[PDB]
Amino acid sequence: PTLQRDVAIVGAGPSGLAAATALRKAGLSVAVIEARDRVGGRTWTDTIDGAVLEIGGQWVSPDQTALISLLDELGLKTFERYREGESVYISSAGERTRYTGDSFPTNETTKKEMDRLIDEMDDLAAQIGAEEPWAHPLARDLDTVSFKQWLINQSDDAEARDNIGLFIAGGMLTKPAHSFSALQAVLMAASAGSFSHLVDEDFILDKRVIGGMQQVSIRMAEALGDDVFLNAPVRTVKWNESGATVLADGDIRVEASRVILAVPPNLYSRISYDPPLPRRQHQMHQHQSLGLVIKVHAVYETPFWREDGLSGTGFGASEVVQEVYDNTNHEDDRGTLVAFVSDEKADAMFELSAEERKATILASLARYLGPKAEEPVVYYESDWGSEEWTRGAYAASFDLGGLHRYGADSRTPVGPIHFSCSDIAAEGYQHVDGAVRMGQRTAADIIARS
Amino acid sequence: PTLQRDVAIVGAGPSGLAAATALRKAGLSVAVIEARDRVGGRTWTDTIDGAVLEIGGQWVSPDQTALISLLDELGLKTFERYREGESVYISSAGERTRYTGDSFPTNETTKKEMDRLIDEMDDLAAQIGAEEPWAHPLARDLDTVSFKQWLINQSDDAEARDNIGLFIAGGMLTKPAHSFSALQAVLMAASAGSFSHLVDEDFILDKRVIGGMQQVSIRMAEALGDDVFLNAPVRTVKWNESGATVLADGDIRVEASRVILAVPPNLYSRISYDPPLPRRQHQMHQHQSLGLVIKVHAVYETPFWREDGLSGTGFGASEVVQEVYDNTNHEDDRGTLVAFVSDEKADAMFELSAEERKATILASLARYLGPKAEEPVVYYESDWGSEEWTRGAYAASFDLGGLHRYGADSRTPVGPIHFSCSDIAAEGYQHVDGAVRMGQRTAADIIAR
Numbered sequence: 037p038t039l040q041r042d043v044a045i046v047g048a049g050p051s052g053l054a055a056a057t058a059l060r061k062a063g064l065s066v067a068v069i070e071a072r073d074r075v076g077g078r079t080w081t082d083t084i085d086g087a088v089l090e091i092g093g094q095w096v097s098p099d100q101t102a103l104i105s106l107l108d109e110l111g112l113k114t115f116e117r118y119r120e121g122e123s124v125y126i127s128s129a130g131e132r133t134r135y136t137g138d139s140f141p142t143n144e145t146t147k148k149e150m151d152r153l154i155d156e157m158d159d160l161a162a163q164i165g166a167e168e169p170w171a172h173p174l175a176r177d178l179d180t181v182s183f184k185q186w187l188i189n190q191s192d193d194a195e196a197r198d199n200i201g202l203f204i205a206g207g208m209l210t211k212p213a214h215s216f217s218a219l220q221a222v223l224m225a226a227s228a229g230s231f232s233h234l235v236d237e238d239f240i241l242d243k244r245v246i247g248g249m250q251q252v253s254i255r256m257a258e259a260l261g262d263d264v265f266l267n268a269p270v271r272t273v274k275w276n277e278s279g280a281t282v283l284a285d286g287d288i289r290v291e292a293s294r295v296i297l298a299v300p301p302n303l304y305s306r307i308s309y310d311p312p313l314p315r316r317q318h319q320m321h322q323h324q325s326l327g328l329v330i331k332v333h334a335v336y337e338t339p340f341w342r343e344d345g346l347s348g349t350g351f352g353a354s355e356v357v358q359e360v361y362d363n364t365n366h367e368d369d370r371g372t373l374v375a376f377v378s379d380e381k382a383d384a385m386f387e388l389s390a391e392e393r394k395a396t397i398l399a400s401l402a403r404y405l406g407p408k409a410e411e412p413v414v415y416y417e418s419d420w421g422s423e424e425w426t427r428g429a430y431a432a433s434f435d436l437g438g439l440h441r442y443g444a445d446s447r448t449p450v451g452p453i454h455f456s457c458s459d460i461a462a463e464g465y466q467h468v469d470g471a472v473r474m475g476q477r478t479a480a481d482i483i484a485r486s
Numbered sequence: 487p488t489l490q491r492d493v494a495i496v497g498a499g500p501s502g503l504a505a506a507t508a509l510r511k512a513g514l515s516v517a518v519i520e521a522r523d524r525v526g527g528r529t530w531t532d533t534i535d536g537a538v539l540e541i542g543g544q545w546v547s548p549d550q551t552a553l554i555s556l557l558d559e560l561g562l563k564t565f566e567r568y569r570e571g572e573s574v575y576i577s578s579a580g581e582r583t584r585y586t587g588d589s590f591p592t593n594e595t596t597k598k599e600m601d602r603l604i605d606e607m608d609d610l611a612a613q614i615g616a617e618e619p620w621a622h623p624l625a626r627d628l629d630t631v632s633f634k635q636w637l638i639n640q641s642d643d644a645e646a647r648d649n650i651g652l653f654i655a656g657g658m659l660t661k662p663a664h665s666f667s668a669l670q671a672v673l674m675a676a677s678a679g680s681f682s683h684l685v686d687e688d689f690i691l692d693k694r695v696i697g698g699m700q701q702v703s704i705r706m707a708e709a710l711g712d713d714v715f716l717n718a719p720v721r722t723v724k725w726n727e728s729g730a731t732v733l734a735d736g737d738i739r740v741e742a743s744r745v746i747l748a749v750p751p752n753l754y755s756r757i758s759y760d761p762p763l764p765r766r767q768h769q770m771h772q773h774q775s776l777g778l779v780i781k782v783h784a785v786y787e788t789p790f791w792r793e794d795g796l797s798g799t800g801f802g803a804s805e806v807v808q809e810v811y812d813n814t815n816h817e818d819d820r821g822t823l824v825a826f827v828s829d830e831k832a833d834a835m836f837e838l839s840a841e842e843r844k845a846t847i848l849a850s851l852a853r854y855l856g857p858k859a860e861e862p863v864v865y866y867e868s869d870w871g872s873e874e875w876t877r878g879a880y881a882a883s884f885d886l887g888g889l890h891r892y893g894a895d896s897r898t899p900v901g902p903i904h905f906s907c908s909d910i911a912a913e914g915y916q917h918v919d920g921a922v923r924m925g926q927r928t929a930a931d932i933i934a935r
């Protein structure tokens with residue numbers, strides 16, 4: 037079919053859908069063209085071996101006002117992650133300690149080092165901000181040093197550096213600390229409101245959506261009805277100064293005034309542009325890549341850890357699994373754990389057979405929470421790297437030096453072509469909130485000019 | 487049309503064509519499917535405002551024995567870049583000095599610092615090598631430190647650091663030194679036989695091909711006749727364990743036992759794979775990017791600099807143009823300069839209007855060679871970044887940390903799908919020689935099976 041619309045939107049993840057929703061409200065017509073047999077993108081609720089799991093994005097923090105607002109608008113409610121009882125910390129020396137409170141049970145020297153690093157990052161994030169970190173006078177120096185090297189420059193305490201790395205490298209960017217810059221760490225902190233917010237799992241991992249995060253996209257897509265096209269990978273965008281023609285599998289042709297590419301930036305070159313994008317985009321797009329993390333799901337007859345006075349929370353910068361949390365579904369009697377294996381550790385796990393990887397990861401969960409962790413009734417690994425329409429997790433970031441070199445241009449339209457994803461967002465960077473904010477920002481931009 | 491072949495080759499640059507040539511010799515049938523209206527890829531001879539120029543790859547060094555061998559095979563001859571007279575060095579302080587000999591005319595302290603850095607890089611390249619740099623016990627530490635930070639760790643002398651950087655960062659990888667690792671610098675040096683080879687422009691920029699480097703591809707393609715398809719972007723590769731179907735514009739369908747993707751790695755995801763490539767490739771391919779350099783051409787009525795006793799060679803790490811050389815065509819009476827503006831300096835130039843960029847570049851050429859440099863009869867910038875079938879120059883390299891993380895897998899076939907380009911080569915890495923070696927290495931792999 038061929039259709040005429042004010043705006044053609046490539047991708048029905050939260051960003052593309054939030055944009056379509058905002059455009060429709062202003063009276064513009066849209067078509068949303070989506071590669072997969074479903075909406076939601078990097079958010080996805082699925083049933084594996086009889087257990088319902090959130091395969092992708094799921095958490096809502098208090099700072100995420102755009103997503104919170106949208107949840108309310110869509111009639112969706114939240115619930116909080118279980119956090120009663122003691123957390124587990126595993127030190128660099130391999131000592132496991134149960135604790136409560138807002139600091140790891142390390143010695144006083146390491147605690148003071150970590151406190152000072154957290155304060156310095158808070159200071160930098162407050163000064164530099166998330167909107168245009170590249171514009172700050174400090175940006176060049178921060179962007180040309182790796183976060184690893186910056187931490188070495190700030191502190192001689194290895195355990196403090198590794199823990200501070202846990203929160204940004206493994207915890208957020210899902211790339212090793214030698215591979216992204218200090219400026220990118222500052223961006224990540226600023227985007228969540230402060231570095232302190234990223235340190236506190238009760239903030240950044242505060243809540244989930246009743247019915248699952250994928251319902252945000254599902255409900256937006258439902259309102260759009262026949263303007264959403266599924267199983268329709270976009271192959272070609274033909275464009276000039278006054279419009280664009282979007283071509284997708286299934287003989288879909290959308291003639292529009294503007295186009296939104298609502299896909300992560302590592303996938304821009306999946307599409308042929310006629311004429312080609314300018315050299316700026318050709319070059320900039322190559323310097324964006326997704327991280328890698330394995331989101332591990334383990335389902336048990338009960339949340340057994342709670343019976344032992346544990347919250348289900350565990351941290352260990354030197355473990356294959358560096359974070360574990362209670363991820364029990366709302367009103368579920370069965371317990372579910374969620375755990376993360378990041379970057380180079382994820383590579384190492386994928387080198388093993390499935391059997392051996394599962395055994396290794398469950399051994400790591402057993403180290404945190406005890407031998408019952410090794411007996412799940414359902415076990416699943418989210419494998420976003422294998423998905424051709426994603427290719428990693430959680431989200432994209434520049435290579436080292438790329439943020440200051442290209443950052444100013446990452447949201448700039450090319451003629452009628454706009455870009456919208458969490459991966460180029462300011463506040464909410466890399467998160468559903470960022471996707472929503474970018475969708476809304478892009479819609480407002482298009483509305484104002486039309 | 488639909489055809490059956492032993493091997494379908496995506497891309498008619500030197501790598502794809504070298505592979506096809508080798509395969510035919512062993513009696514395997516091929517089709518070479520090429521996006522552009524021409525062969526040669528990043529090698530390209532073109533005429534701009536009536537002047538013949540080499541828009542892309544052009545130089546042959548003595549270490550490049552695979553290319554030299556191929557040249558002989560194709561009946562192509564070489565000539566040497568003009569190098570008589572004095573070179574020009576511009577110091578960090580902006581001092582311009584004419585000189586001869588194999589070291590910059592800096593003070594003795596800076597000269598010693600540079601010598602020590604060159605020796606250390608030579609040592610590292612000899613130990614680590616170009617074949618599998620990631621496998622060496624020193625590799626992990628070298629790959630997790632930027633070349634900039636490594637230079638800071640080795641020497642306090644900024645002028646020495648910046649000059650060493652000129653040879654690797656601006657001069658080869660065409661990325662800033664803060665963005666790639668020490669191991670990547672070591673790889674680049676090893677790939678050319680030593681760091682010392684990269685320092686000496688009489689080695690790495692020794693010779694050009696009579697008739698132009700593109701003739702290497704043109705002659706290989708001519709021998710293949712109707713098995714080369716032009717104006718045929720490959721869109722889809724459908725595959726299983728025993729074969730592949732390659733689909734290209736113009737209703738081209740090639741059914742083959744094996745496929746060679748003979749394209750730079752930043753372009754692998756231009757093609758849809760059915761089924762998708764494994765997660766290893768999905769991830770690794772995102773961490774590969776081309777550098778950026780503006781290859782500047784300036785044509786004059788004569789090689790005026792020679793009249794002033796200058797070779798045309800100039801170096802200045804703090805100039806917008808950090809290198810300039812005599813690039814006069816073989817038997818041409820007109821003089822042609824070649825100059826290079828790299829990475830972030832290239833970005834800064836492209837921010838200016840064409841008029842202002844030209845004026846800025848030529849003012850830099852005039853600093854090296856005098857006011858006559860500002861009056862070329864023809865002026866041209868190679869703009870590989872704009873080319874959708876290249877998207878930068880010279881070649882691709884991993885982001886920081888990528889070489890040790892993914893290097894071992896950069897040549898690994900996926901079922902029937904092989905990978906061949908200069909950007910994943912060992913010896914001759916990023917150069918025509920590397921493209922040729924990889925094409926031949928890939929062919930031998932398939933032939934032996």
Ligand SMILES: Cc1cc2nc3c(=O)[nH]c(=O)nc-3n(C[C@H](O)[C@H](O)[C@H](O)COP(=O)(O)OP(=O)(O)OC[C@H]3O[C@@H](n4cnc5c(N)ncnc54)[C@H](O)[C@@H]3O)c2cc1C
Nearest residue numbers: 047049050051071077078093094095270457458466467468
């Ligand atoms: C394992 C995992 C855990 C996460 N955890 C958190 C967390 O808990 N909290 C949170 O806030 N977020 C988290 N994230 C990140 C969050 O899910 C993403 O930031 C968000 O989904 C990004 O939305 P988007 O619309 O910007 O991109 P996407 O969700 O990726 O949507 C892009 C869409 O484009 C489609 N597409 C791509 N190319 C084409 C094409 N050529 N033609 C047509 N369609 C195309 C894709 O199929 C996809 O549907 C998580 C993500 C993952 C993977």
Ligand SMILES: Cc1cc2nc3c(=O)[nH]c(=O)nc-3n(C[C@H](O)[C@H](O)[C@H](O)COP(=O)(O)OP(=O)(O)OC[C@H]3O[C@@H](n4cnc5c(N)ncnc54)[C@H](O)[C@@H]3O)c2cc1C
Nearest residue numbers: 497499501521527528543544545720907908916917918921
């Ligand atoms: C300005 C510049 C100066 C250079 N200087 C030197 C130097 O002097 N000496 C030297 O040795 N080399 C130098 N190089 C590098 C050298 O040119 C390259 O290393 C070499 O050409 C790489 O060959 P290749 O076959 O590996 O890739 P390419 O030459 O890039 O060939 C790849 C081919 O694949 C085609 N293609 C891409 N995608 C598709 C698709 N989907 N379907 C069909 N076809 C496709 C492209 O059009 C291209 O023709 C230079 C390069 C540039 C750009």
